[PDB]
Amino acid sequence: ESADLRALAKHLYDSYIKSFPLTKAKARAILTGKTTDKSPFVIYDMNSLMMGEDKIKFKEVAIRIFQGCQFRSVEAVQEITEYAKSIPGFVNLDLNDQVTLLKYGVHEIIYTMLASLMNKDGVLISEGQGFMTREFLKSLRKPFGDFMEPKFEFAVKFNALELDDSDLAIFIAVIILSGDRPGLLNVKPIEDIQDNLLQALELQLKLNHPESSQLFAKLLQKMTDLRQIVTEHVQLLQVIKKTETDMSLHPLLQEIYKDL
Annotated binding site: 70-73, 107, 233, 257
Check the CA dihedral 32-34-40-44 and report its sign.
Answer: positive
| 253 φψ region: left (φ > 0), alpha (ψ -120 to 50), beta (else) | alpha
Taking the C-alpha atoms of residue 103 and residue 107, their distance in angstroms, rounded to an integer, is 8
Q: Exposed, middle or buried, 173 (CB in 10 Å: 0-12/13-18/19+)?
A: buried
Contacts of 34 (CB under 8 A, 6+ apart): none
Helix axes 95-114, 223-243, angle to 10 degrees: 90
**Residue positions forming the annotated binding site for rosiglitazone:** 70-73, 107, 233, 257
Taking the C-alpha atoms of residue 257 and residue 260, their distance in angstroms, rounded to an integer, is 9
| Nearest CA among 142, 132, 18 for reference residue 72 | 132
Which helix (H) or strand (E) segment holds residue 77: the answer is helix 61-85
CA 208 to chain centre: 22
